[PDB]
Amino acid sequence: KTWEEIPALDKELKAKGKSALMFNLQEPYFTWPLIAADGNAGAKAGLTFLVDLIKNKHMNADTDYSIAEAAFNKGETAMTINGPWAWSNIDTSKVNYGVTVLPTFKGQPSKPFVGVLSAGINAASPNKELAKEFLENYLLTDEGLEAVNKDKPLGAVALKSYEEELAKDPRIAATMENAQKGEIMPNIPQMSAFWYAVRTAVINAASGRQTVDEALKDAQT
Amino acid sequence: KLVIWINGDKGYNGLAEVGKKFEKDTGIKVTVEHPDKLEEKFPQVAATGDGPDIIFWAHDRFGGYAQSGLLAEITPDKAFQDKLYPFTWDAVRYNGKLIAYPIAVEALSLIYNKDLLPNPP
Amino acid sequence: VGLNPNFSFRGKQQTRIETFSDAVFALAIALLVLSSTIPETFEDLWASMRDVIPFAICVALIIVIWYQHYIFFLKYGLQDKVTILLNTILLFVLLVYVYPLKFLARFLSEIYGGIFGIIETDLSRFGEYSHQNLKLLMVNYGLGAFAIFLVFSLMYWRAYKMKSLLDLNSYEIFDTKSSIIANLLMCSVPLLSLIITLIDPWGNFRTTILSGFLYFLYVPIMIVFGRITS
Amino acid sequence: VGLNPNFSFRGKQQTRIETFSDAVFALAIALLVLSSTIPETFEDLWASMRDVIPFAICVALIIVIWYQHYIFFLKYGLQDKVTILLNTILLFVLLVYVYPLKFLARFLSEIYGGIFGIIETDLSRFGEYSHQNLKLLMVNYGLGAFAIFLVFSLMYWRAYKMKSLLDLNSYEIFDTKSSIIANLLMCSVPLLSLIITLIDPWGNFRTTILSGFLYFLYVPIM
Ligand SMILES: OC[C@H]1O[C@H](O[C@H]2[C@H](O)[C@@H](O)[C@@H](O)O[C@@H]2CO)[C@H](O)[C@@H](O)[C@@H]1O
């Protein structure tokens, strides 16, 4: 239920030839919940913990989406951090999985960023009216979203008609739990420069180049 | 050609499977048709044109066909007659003459979704 | 068949905790009645039939607890140490309050018997009805009722803590959360009598009247909580 | 195995209501016998052996109720609030008439013992057999029997009210309807004795004598 009790659990699991937690450390969207758990002083706390996990050999230095996914699906790691989309691949494997609340850090919850999957029409497209037809009458329909969802889960769909089906799923409940503890990302143009600043900062601190204090300095600029 | 007129909400595919066994034992074709408004298309077409050989509908429409002279008198032997419930034969009787063969009793019921409504009104 | 159509009943199969529990509920209601003496004469027979009103009230009260137990174990099918622990605490409280309920039920049946005018038999058999004793009566039974509902709240909270392990859906999470609130709200009424009696604002029977009158105000607060969820 | 070959038994799996109920039936028949004192001398033993005829009568009577309970829960597999409520009322009635029956069975076992000539012990042990006492006796065990068959009728009516939810077929609907009638007809005999004893037409033992006789003609009066 807490981030701070993972090192103990990892010591226990490493004795039996298993990891505790493996997730994508390269993409900052996955590391941000821990970083933003308290908050600055909050970012310094959250990241130092993440740095200590790699320093204590609990997590690998270059842990990416593929080796984390594969390791969990194979049955090598006891935990992983991922989205709705990842569930179908677990179902394919023979792993009795559970989706739950993200661990708390410094008592407070880990605040994961909330994304709204959205479809936009390219300004330089001649098929603007044909795309509107596809999006409205064919995709954003009960039948349409069902087709996408049975391939790889969408999460909590925006369609009002899908509330009953969403509510029947325990994994959706866990997703909504984390979404309430997190916050929706502002759409602002500066988000790109922000994400890049966090992507470098996390990689530098993970590998062992820049210090945790120097990472937030270069990132705030 | 043996042509049968029965409503589209009924089991015409199954009625055809009976018709397919008939052709195997005799050689006569048994096509099953389901046209719209057959209850009011039959007395117009069957009077003038050929229409169907056998007409399937609830017994209530048959008295009008019988008065107009659009139906042959049914003459089934005792042994066949005895296979069906005597009350069913009464429904297919107009002025002391059997005007059809009774198949089944039909009545509307309340169909409900047990998941959305376990104790219905 | 069940309470909620959206709830998936994990405990349809009978378990040891439930079998043991059933014996104890049966043992409780059964020994409440059958703890009485066997009539040996017509006089005893008529005396023993005066006990059915008190027993009906007790039995009604115990099955209401049994029902809540049945519904909990039906909902979650739990069987872990902590559930066993909380379950034992419950049965323990039940058991210690079986004979005291027989007592209270007989006592109140005489008091209400006198009021309506059915009977006119003595209450001196119960042993001095003093302010201190009538206060301890509330505090005792009030502490009992509070504990039962407190334990039911803890049991539902244990299921809430294992929501992911139990694969609880949004409807089931909501039910569980509502069941905790329901049991804490149920517990609040005896907690409020008990506190009022222990402080004793009036220093006389008035205290006991108010404390007893709060049980009559369960119905309205229960309706508020039921209305809020609908 | 079962009563009807056309009935589909919904309650083959044991449930909590049935497990609880089984304890209470067992607790009843078991405490009826084991409520007695433990013999500490041969004198106390030979006395408890006189008690077996009344116990046999009582036990036979309680299993007959248990059987009807077993068949109902086997037929419908019901487990709802109203079924729980009616089931509790039943077990409550049972429980109240356990020790009373231990007494009536002993009372009749003494009277009928005297008649046949097996024993010659006193009936003053039972403390005044006045008209009002022997009247109240028939009003008591008559009110008990009536209320047990009345409850069984209500339980079958609850299943009849849920016929569609239970997916009851024409044979099962008929059985359910017949079971309601059976239990109301069973309840009618004690309801008659009770009404006879209460109205008291003769004003003497002629009333009580009849009230006991209506049970002996259970099948014919049905
Ligand atoms: O990693 C930073 C990256 O995170 C978010 O992207 C998510 C995307 O939203 C998810 O759907 C998922 O596929 O993973 C991506 C990260 O791997 C932000 O949306 C994006 O702007 C940002 O670059």
All residues of chain B having their beta carbon less than 8 Å from the beta carbon of residue C1 are 118
Residues paired with residue A184 on neighbouring β-strands, in sequence order: A114
Nearest-CA neighbor of A23 among A152, A206, A209?
Answer: A206
Give Dmax over CA atoms of chain D in angstroms: 61
To test ligand 1's pocket by mutation, which of A25, A27, A200 has the most ligand atoms within 8 angstroms of CB? A27
Rounded CA-CA distance D16/C15 in Å is 10
Domain of A15: which CATH number?
3.40.190.10
String of DSSP letters for B35-98: -TTHHHHHHHHHHHS---SEE---GGGHHHHHHHT-SPPP---HHHHTTS-HHHHHHTBSSSSB
Supply the DSSP symbol for B119: S
String of DSSP letters for C176-195: HHHHHHHHHHHHHHHHHHHH
Q: Is C61 on the interface with D (CB under 8 A)?
A: no
- Strand runs labelled E in A91-198: 113-114, 183-184
Question: Does ligand 1 come within 6 angstroms of the Cβ of A33?
Answer: no
Rounded CA-CA distance B62/B55 in Å is 10
- In C, minimum Cα distance to A167 occurs at C170
D92 to B82, C46, C187, D79: CA distances (angstroms): 56, 18, 27, 18
Nearest-CA neighbor of D23 among C21, C11, C16?
Answer: C21
Residues paired with residue B54 on neighbouring β-strands, in sequence order: B4
Question: Does ligand 1 come within 6 angstroms of the Cβ of A195?
Answer: yes
- In C, minimum Cα distance to A97 occurs at C165
Question: Does ligand 1 come within 6 angstroms of the Cβ of A170?
Answer: no
Rounded CA-CA distance C217/C222 in Å is 9
How far is ligand 1, taken at its centre, from the CA of residue A29, in Å? Answer: 6
| Residue numbers of the domain that contains A204 | 1-113+196-220
Helices (H), chain C: 16-34, 42-49, 52-76, 81-96, 98-116, 131-161, 170-199, 206-213, 219-229
Q: Which atom of ligand 1 is nearest to the CA of A198?
A: 2
Residue D5 has which token pair? Answer: 């070959």
Residues 6 or more apart from A198 whose CB is under 8 A from it?
A28, A32, A35, A219
Residues comprising chain D, all counted? 222
8 A C-beta contact, residue C16 and residue C64: no
Residue A209 has which token pair? Answer: 């180049």
- In B, minimum Cα distance to D164 occurs at B119
All residues of chain C having their beta carbon less than 8 Å from the beta carbon of residue B118 are 1, 5
Rounded CA-CA distance C119/C220 in Å is 32
**Which amino acid makes up residue C206?**
R
Handedness of CA C90, C91, C92, C94 (dihedral sign): positive
**Which amino acid makes up residue C163?**
K
Tell me how many helices (H) and strands (E) chain D has: 9, 0
Q: What does the buried/exposed string (b/e) look like for D11-45 if buried means 16 or more CB atoms within 10 Å of the residue's CB? A: beeebbbbbbbbbbbebbbebbeeeeeeeeeeeee
8 A C-beta contact, residue A21 and residue A77: yes
Question: Does ligand 1 come within 6 angstroms of the Cβ of A28?
Answer: yes
Residue A125 has which token pair? Answer: 């497209």
- In C, minimum Cα distance to D99 occurs at C38
Look up tokens 């703890």; give the residue. C35
Expressed in Å, this structure's resolution amounts to: 3.2
What element of type H or E holds B2? Answer: strand B2-5
B and D in touch (3+ CB pairs within 8 angstroms): yes
Percent of chain A that is helix, strand, coil (3-state, to 5): 55, 5, 40
| Interface size, chain C vs chain D, as Cβ–Cβ contacts under 8 Å | 109
Judging by DSSP bridges, how do beta strands A113-114 and A183-184 pair with one another?
parallel
C6 to B114, C3, C223, C227: CA distances (angstroms): 12, 9, 22, 19
Question: Does ligand 1 come within 6 angstroms of the Cβ of A194?
Answer: no
Q: Is A9 on the interface with C (CB under 8 A)?
A: no
A128 to A125, A134, C23, D177: CA distances (angstroms): 6, 10, 72, 68
Q: CB–CB of A170 and C165 under 8 A? A: no
Residue C168 has which token pair? Answer: 């609880």
Handedness of CA B58, B60, B66, B69 (dihedral sign): negative
Question: Does ligand 1 come within 6 angstroms of the Cβ of A29?
Answer: yes
**Which amino acid makes up residue A147?**
A
- Quote the distance between the C-alpha of residue B75 and its chain's center: 17
Q: What is the nearest CA distance from C67 to chain A, expressed in angstroms?
A: 26
Question: Breaks in chain A at C–N > 2.5 Å: after which residues?
Answer: 39
CB A221: neighbour CB atoms within 10 A?
A: 6
Rounded CA-CA distance C56/D163 in Å is 31
Nearest CA to ligand 1 atom 19: A115
All residues of chain C having their beta carbon less than 8 Å from the beta carbon of residue D35 are 34, 38
Q: Which atom of ligand 1 is nearest to the CA of A65?
A: 17
String of DSSP letters for A23-87: --SSSHHHHHHHHTTT--HHHHHHHHHHHHHHHTTSS-TT--HHHHHHHHHHT-EEE----GGGH
Rounded CA-CA distance A66/D61 in Å is 73
Q: Is D14 on the interface with C (CB under 8 A)?
A: yes
Phi, psi of B30 (to 5 degrees): -125, 90
Burial label for A15, CB within 10 Å (0-12, 13-18, 19+), is: exposed
Rounded CA-CA distance C191/A1 in Å is 32
Residues paired with residue A19 on neighbouring β-strands, in sequence order: A77
Rounded CA-CA distance B57/B100 in Å is 10
Q: CB–CB of D31 and C36 under 8 A? A: no
All residues of chain B having their beta carbon less than 8 Å from the beta carbon of residue D162 are 119
Phi, psi of A136 (to 5 degrees): -75, -60
8 A C-beta contact, residue C111 and residue C123: yes
Nearest-CA neighbor of A104 among A11, A5, A175, A190?
Answer: A5
Q: What does the buried/exposed string (b/e) look like for A52-67 if buried means 16 or more CB atoms within 10 Å of the residue's CB? A: ebbeeebbbeebeeee
Selected for mutation to probe chain C from A168, A169, A175, A176 (highest C CB count within 10 Å) is A168
Q: Which atom of ligand 1 is nearest to the CA of A24?
A: 17
Nearest CA to ligand 1 atom 15: A29
CB A174: neighbour CB atoms within 10 A?
A: 21
Q: At what angle do helices D131-161 and D98-116 cross, to 10 degrees?
A: 130
8 A C-beta contact, residue D95 and residue D24: yes
8 A C-beta contact, residue D95 and residue C34: yes
Residue C20 has which token pair? Answer: 């043991």
Q: What is the nearest CA distance from C10 to chain D, expressed in angstroms?
A: 14
